[PDB]
Amino acid sequence: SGVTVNDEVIKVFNDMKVRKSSTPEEIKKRKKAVLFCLSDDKKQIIVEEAKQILVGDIGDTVEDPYTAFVKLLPLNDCRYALYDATYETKESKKEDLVFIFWAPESAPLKSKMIYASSKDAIKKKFTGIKHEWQVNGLDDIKDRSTLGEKLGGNVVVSLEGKPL
Amino acid sequence: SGVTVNDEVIKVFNDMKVRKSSTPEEIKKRKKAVLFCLSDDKKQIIVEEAKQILVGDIGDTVEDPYTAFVKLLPLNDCRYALYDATYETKESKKEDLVFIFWAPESAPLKSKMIYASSKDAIKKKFTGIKHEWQVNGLDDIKDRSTLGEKLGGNVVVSLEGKPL
Amino acid sequence: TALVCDNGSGLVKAGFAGDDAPRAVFPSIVGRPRHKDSYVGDEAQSKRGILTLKYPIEGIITNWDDMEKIWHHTFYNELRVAPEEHPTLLTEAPLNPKANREKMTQIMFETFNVPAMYVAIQAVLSLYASGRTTGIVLDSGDGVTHNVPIYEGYALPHAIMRLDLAGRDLTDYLMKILTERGYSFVTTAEREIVRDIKEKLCYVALDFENEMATAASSSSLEKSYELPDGQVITIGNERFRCPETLFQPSFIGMESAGIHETTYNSIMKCDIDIRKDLYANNVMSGGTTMYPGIADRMQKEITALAPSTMKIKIIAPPERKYSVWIGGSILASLSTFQQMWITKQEYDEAGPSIVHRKCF
Amino acid sequence: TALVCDNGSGLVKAGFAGDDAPRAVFPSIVGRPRHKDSYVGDEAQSKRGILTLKYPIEGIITNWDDMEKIWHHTFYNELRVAPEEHPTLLTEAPLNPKANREKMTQIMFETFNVPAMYVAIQAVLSLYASGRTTGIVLDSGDGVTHNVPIYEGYALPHAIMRLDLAGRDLTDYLMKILTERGYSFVTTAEREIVRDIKEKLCYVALDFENEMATAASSSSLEKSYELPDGQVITIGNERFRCPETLFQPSFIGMESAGIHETTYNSIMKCDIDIRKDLYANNVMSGGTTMYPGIADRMQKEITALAPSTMKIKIIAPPERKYSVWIGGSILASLSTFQQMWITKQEYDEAGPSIVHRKCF
Amino acid sequence: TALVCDNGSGLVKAGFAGDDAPRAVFPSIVGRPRHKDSYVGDEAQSKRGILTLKYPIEGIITNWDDMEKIWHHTFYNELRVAPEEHPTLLTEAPLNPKANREKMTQIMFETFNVPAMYVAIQAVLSLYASGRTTGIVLDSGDGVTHNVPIYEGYALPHAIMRLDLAGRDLTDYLMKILTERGYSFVTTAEREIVRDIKEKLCYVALDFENEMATAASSSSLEKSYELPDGQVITIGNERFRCPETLFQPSFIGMESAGIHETTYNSIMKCDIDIRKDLYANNVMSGGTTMYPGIADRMQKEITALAPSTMKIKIIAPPERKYSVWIGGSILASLSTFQQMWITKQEYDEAGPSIVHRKCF
Ligand SMILES: Nc1ncnc2c1ncn2[C@@H]1O[C@H](COP(=O)(O)OP(=O)(O)O)[C@@H](O)[C@H]1O
Ligand SMILES: Nc1ncnc2c1ncn2[C@@H]1O[C@H](COP(=O)(O)OP(=O)(O)O)[C@@H](O)[C@H]1O
Ligand SMILES: Nc1ncnc2c1ncn2[C@@H]1O[C@H](COP(=O)(O)OP(=O)(O)O)[C@@H](O)[C@H]1O
Ligand SMILES: [Mg+2]
Ligand SMILES: [Mg+2]
Ligand SMILES: [Mg+2]
């Protein structure tokens, strides 16, 4: 139903889904969180230019990789996002990546309709992504416990190094 | 709205609704049809004295238990009645008992009003009676097929041993 | 004389032993008002807009305070005989737990004060009344559908399949596909009329694609039904689209196997040496196997699953609607059955534990 | 440029794609004289004492000789553009049969000669225009009320509830409870005035007993309306007694569940793992969810039914009256939607069967 | 760095060597639609009503076109590292045929292009991680239950018992005995919930008759579980009636010996001089030995079979669920293990025959 995804998006997804042997410099240039947006004439999903969190910027400029991800998202417009989560369950220590469909209630209808019909066109190209999470209100994403609610519910015990 | 039912009526109803182990003499003294009337001062529903059909009088003095029931009813006055019907449906052979509210169009209004307001006071005391049938004109009760019309409509195939 | 009270999933069948058909056939419903205390059977089906309807046998007895109402309505208001002077046979579903078989015996002796009773299995009496002691019994009732494989008079409990698709979910699907035409059936009294359209005008398609492609061009298919107020509704290709739900349960949205594959997965779960005497002896029963063309469709669909050297035979007797009841009316009217029963003295000297010993 | 013609149950909404609101809003009525041959839309609402009024979409299209009239009146007399030069999006109700979706495509290409068309679902466009792809959509129109649960952009067809209580039966109840005061509204032109009292002065009571007990003593409640001839009628406690019929259908005499319980029995009919993302995403639409205080009453009544650990959230967007139309005006004014449409050449090489393939 | 991919019967455990627990735990399922081409692991467990589920390790690898899918899903979508830059340890079941051990080595070097690999035995790594080299290993997984007697680091192949009763057949029995209460679990997503009731609330009865006679009168036993939609189901005496199937397989209808008698008939099949150092060193592992009270029941039931002068001891380590994986994560993170591996150059100069020589 309309929009196609650009090939620069799929290259950013293949830098996150399959990691590979890396120097200590290059493993600090992998992406912990990425925002995907729409182009000016609204025909293609593109990687947004200066809204991303690198793995190497955690513990210095970014104190916490989740509290500094909620601040990227605009409150009057819609986005896709892609977050590489680090969580420990009761028996196992895991690491999976989460597809976030951000569409706040304060956004205009021409930016809420055009991503809801284009979501299936960018999910199909993202092979093997398990955790979908649509988010509308700020209050549903702002807290740390509401990510661990989608990921395991009651079996998560430590999300991004901090206990729940 | 007025009249109560006498306790000699409820004893006659419990002799018909639940039958029990009987000698061949006593099973010929169960009641196939009973008429209930009003007392002289019109305060109580009583069992009418000599208008009833016994099961033991069928096939001898009473040739047919339904044609000899229509002849009991008075054409210028109103009655309740209580008829133990014997009917075979398409798949099953049944036996249930029918409450008849007889109120002809030729009766006076002081005998038509006083049973219509007292019907709910004698139906409530008759637990589990399924087939209510108000009758006004003679032509609606006289035929055999108009009892089988209330009982099953088109699924009755033999009423009182005779085919329809 | 003996009473035979079949504890149906959606219809209590009850009558006196030695009769060909049950005297009383009424729904397994106890209705209570939203805001007399409780209405039972046909009374709760007649009243409208004021009752909430509950089922105590929705095939295993769930509520024993509601089941006592159902049986009190059977003996007094429908059979019309006192229970303390008549011995009372009862029936239980396959895979009924051992505690539920003792509570069924305690109610008859302590509440209703029966002189004697007996409890039989609903699948075994269906197979004995088709002249067999070995054969797989498809018992498709109102609320539950069982496949019970029986070898030499004993049902194999690990192999008994249970499907929760049954004839009640075909009524509530026939109210949806007749809403497509425009007949807005929605009330409780307009559910009984849809259930009477289902008996008289439905049939199972021999092949669904070639029947539904014939349903567009042909005029033979289309029937006309007459409602209780004399209006005439015209049913078309909803005649075979309704009982085809039993063979494709994806129509009613569940992922379960059809009745031609829960039958096959109950023969394959039995021991290897006895499967050939279950393939050649499929026996059907219950109200929902009464459709015409269902013995011809079960043979076709099981043959397409089963290996090619096995003989697939479906036996449909013509009185299979009441075969569980008729088998209990013959067996309790035998003169040599009189020492088989559990008497009230045997309850007083052994409690509810007697039922396992003598009603095995 | 593209036409978006929403096939409403009681109001045809139609306009050009890219506009914020429909150009044409008119009733779904074809009127014929009792003894010009047929009057359509506002003409049959204006004439009095001489016409018999018929509805072809009384939510599923019943009469295709009357529906061709409705659409001929939309393109020429109300939109005011020729249909052969403009592509025409259309909408269909949930649970629309497959034969009715082909006849809707055959009329556009053979009668009106459209260059291209598309057919969408009315519940899905309501959910996409609230920024969601998963959520239960309460679509309460004039003639029908649907609950459509949608999980990942696909409506679950076995779980779609349909209630036949809707905003048209609230107009014909408001003419009864204003007859209690003494305002004898009875004509066809006095039904439109009652329908305009309903929009401007009705509201849903938060608790009916404490509002109706306050309605006896308080003077805040009582409003004054001014009729087309300048007379002043005074409405009292008929402001909240009218839309309370949606929550208690026993007022209008039917036994059906209210809109706070057909919503609950549509979440409970969905699979066990996805019910928590339907409880927290109830989305409303249609003209009859426009009452103030109905998002605050739906949250209270569903919370009293639902288990206590589930988060019940009702989302009411402020333009929910036309959200099915606005969602089809954005989606057909996209420049990248131009290859999505069904062209006239694709009809000529595949017949009406094309609609299932490209308008899924 | 090294990958350790345990080829589980019902759960693939996979992680990086040196971690305490596996990163990826997902089912051994490849699902295909009835009528993307194939869904693997958690995707085929999530989808409903449309897939047919197949297992390639239903403990010996049956289908190599489905097993390549499982391993492609482990490296890329769950571990998240490319296989050509990481050496890959694998595990095989006891009594794995010699041709299946060569095809497992050919896929890693020719399809996935690993730089090095190694294949170990699942029973030997369980015994070494309990600080022993001699002892009988009860490895009770999802799909198969093995008793492997090991004397001085070498499993005795004629004495290895295999029981086909395992933890998967306890899930499909717990859906039957909770159907007795009335909780009609039947769908694929309602099988995972029953499998999570089994982990958290089941336990092995110390004596079955005195526990089940206490279960009628006592209120301590009865627990309450909360479903994904917040409904509360109450489980009673189905807590100990489920894992008692392992000690009495006649409950699930098979004639096989229990796990306290396949253990005994594996010690009696070993040589006469070494049986005393197997009686005193029973070691357990796998997911299905995690029940509380099963080390106290295995000691009681083996002591009743074994002669009276022998010391019967059951060793249950607390992390025995993943002991086959943890033993392969220690052994592949050793710095002195770096010349043990089979390199890609050794495959190019000796074909698949290398695996017998270096992975003995
Ligand atoms: N001729 C028929 N065709 C199809 N269904 C029928 C027919 N007669 C009865 N039924 C159905 O069979 C069901 C009752 O069967 P029954 O065996 O008595 O069920 P149960 O014992 O589970 O109460 C009802 O759903 C009824 O509508
Ligand atoms: N503000 C309002 N308050 C209450 N009902 C309203 C309001 N505005 C419109 N309606 C009603 O909504 C109905 C029309 O809604 P609509 O969604 O267009 O229906 P349909 O699509 O079924 O034709 C009419 O019954 C109308 O009276
Ligand atoms: N705490 C537990 N209690 C009982 N069974 C458990 C427990 N945890 C896991 N299981 C079961 O163990 C099985 C998985 O064990 P596993 O050793 O991984 O099997 P496999 O290697 O054969 O795939 C599953 O049937 C699972 O339900
Ligand atoms: Mg039955
Ligand atoms: Mg609408
Ligand atoms: Mg294992």
Numbering used by the authors:
A (entry chain I), B (entry chain J): 3 to 166
C (entry chain C), D (entry chain D), E (entry chain B): 6 to 40, 50 to 72, 74 to 375
Could you give the paper's own sentences about this structure?
The actin-depolymerizing factor (ADF)/cofilin protein family consists of small actin-binding proteins of 13–19 kDa that play central roles in accelerating actin turnover by disassembling actin filaments (F-actin). ADF/cofilins are expressed in all eukaryotes, and their function in accelerating actin turnover directly affects the dynamics of motile structures, such as listeria comet tails, lamellipodia, filopodia, and neural growth cones. After binding F-actin, ADF/cofilin severs the filament. Thus, ADF/cofilin contributes to actin monomer recycling by accelerating actin filament turnover.
In the present study, via cryo-electron microscopy (cryo-EM) we obtain a 3.8 Å resolution cofilactin structure reconstructed from chicken cofilin and chicken skeletal muscle actin. A single bound Mg2+ ion and ADP (without density for a γ-phosphate) were clearly visualized, indicating that cofilactin was bound to ADP and not to ATP under the experimental conditions. All of the main chains were traced without ambiguity except for actin residues 1–6 (N-terminus), 41–49 (DNaseI-binding loop, D-loop) and cofilin residues 1–2 (N-terminus), indicating disorder or large fluctuations in these regions. Cofilin interacts with two adjacent actin subunits in a single strand. The helical pitch was shortened (Δϕ = 36°, where Δϕ is the helical rotation angle between two adjacent subunits on one strand) relative to the canonical actin filament (Δϕ ∼ 27°), which is consistent with previous results. Here, the actin protomer in the cofilactin structure is designated as “C-form” actin. The conformational transition from G-form to C-form actin is described by a 6.0° rotation of the OD relative to the ID around a new axis, designated as the “G/C axis” (orange in Fig. 2e), which is orthogonal to the G/F axis. During this transition, the inner domain (ID, subdomains 3 and 4) and subdomain 1 (SD1) of the actin subunit act as two independent rigid bodies. Only a few weak interactions between the ODs of the two subunits were observed. The structure of the ID–ID interface is essentially identical in cofilactin and F-actin (blue in Fig. 3a, b); however, the OD–ID interactions are almost lost in cofilactin because of the conformational change in the actin subunit structure. The number of interstrand interactions is also decreased in the cofilactin filament relative to F-actin.
